[PDB]
Amino acid sequence: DRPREHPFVVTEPGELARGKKNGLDYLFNLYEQAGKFLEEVQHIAREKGEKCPTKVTNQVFRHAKVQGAGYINKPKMRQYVHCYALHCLASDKSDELRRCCKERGENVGAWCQACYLPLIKMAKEKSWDIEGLFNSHDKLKIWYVPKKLIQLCHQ
Amino acid sequence: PREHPFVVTEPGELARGKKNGLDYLFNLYEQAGKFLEEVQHIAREKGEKCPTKVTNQVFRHAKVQGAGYINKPKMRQYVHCYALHCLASDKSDELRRCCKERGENVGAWCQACYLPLIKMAKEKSWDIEGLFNSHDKLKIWYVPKKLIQLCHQEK
DNA sequence: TTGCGTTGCTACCGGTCGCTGCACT
DNA sequence: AAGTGCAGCGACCGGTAGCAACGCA
């Protein structure tokens, strides 16, 4: 029971998946879901007067799992947060990057390495990486900055 | 079961009854060492990765070897003090002898053992890692976070 | 006995490498 | 199916907060 899911594959905005595979608009939505689990946990925290998370803790993951959403797991969500960042911040540029990678016949893996360079430049436009994630956008607030992003960002 | 609480001691000065001295403390790392030695060897024979340092595996090893008394959090707590004993036993010992006068708790002994360390961080251009890497022992012990930042703050 | 403070160490955090499982010749 | 290439996510890592338990008041 509770089986594995089929791989992601690069899509244009709006585009739907090719059967036994998933699109990137799905991927983004997943994060939004995670959000709605953190919402649920936070409520379960006030009641029972426990400490209120503010971010995605392993708890939340555990929680999604038990309500049957294992598809929201820790390593995946980290694997692709750099991209969720891109989508949230400059959906414009995410969208274009998706097209480019689409018509160049890229796999999802390349996309990941690709999505880095814009973010870097966006940081150059600003300064503090954390700032961006740091409650800059209500959606990106709940997620931790990845380590790699931080070090490389300013180099 | 739960080890007798640590209590500050001069060099030598074997403690008595329901307590353990600081010489015993340091002897714990010495032991940990022989466990890493044992692990390293096994890995070779089992053709797996041989660690340069004391990893969760080693701890687990010892527990099996009935030496739970060597555990992760503890060693970490006191890792900074051991550094001193290794590097400048001279200075460590004086810290200890003084501490017999005031008869403070181990908590004090620790949070104080730092001052002399950071002093050594100077001269060596705050290359703590190098410093640990210098001694034959210590090598096997990951520099603690506090030390880096608490040193870094001064910088 | 009665209660507290200190501290040993369970138990879990946030991170993530690299093994499977899966999709195809 | 065996073989290869991808990628999901199990299965740990290194850290450390904070509860019990013990030893002392």
Domains and CATH numbers, chain A: 24-153 (1.10.4180.10)
**Neighbouring-strand partners of residue A22:** A8
CA dist., res. A86 & res. A90, Å (int)? 6
Q: Enumerate residues near strand C (beta carbon within 7 A).
A: A 3-4, 6-7, 20, 53, 55, 57-59, 74-75, 78, 144-148; B 2-3, 5-7, 20, 68-69, 71-74, 77, 105-107
> What Å value separates CA B87 and C1' C19?
41
Determine the nucleotide nearest to B63 by Cα–C1' distance.
Answer: C9
This entry's atomic model was obtained through X-ray
Report CA(B6)–C1'(C16) in Å, whole number.
36
Residue–nucleotide distance: B76 CA to D17 C1' (Å): 13
Of B36, B42, B78, B41, the residue nearest B56 (C-alpha): B36
Contacts of A121 (CB under 8 A, 6+ apart): none
Is A4 near strand D, with its CB below 7 A from some atom of it? Answer: yes
**DSSP output for A83-140:** HHHHHHH-HHHHHHHHHHHHHTT--HHHHHHHHHHHHHHHHHHSS-HHHIIIIISTTT
* Rounded-to-integer distance, Cα B46 and Cα B42, Å: 6
Token pair for residue B113?
């053992």
**Whether A50 CB is under 7 Å from strand D:** no
Distance A64 CA to C25 C1' (A): 37
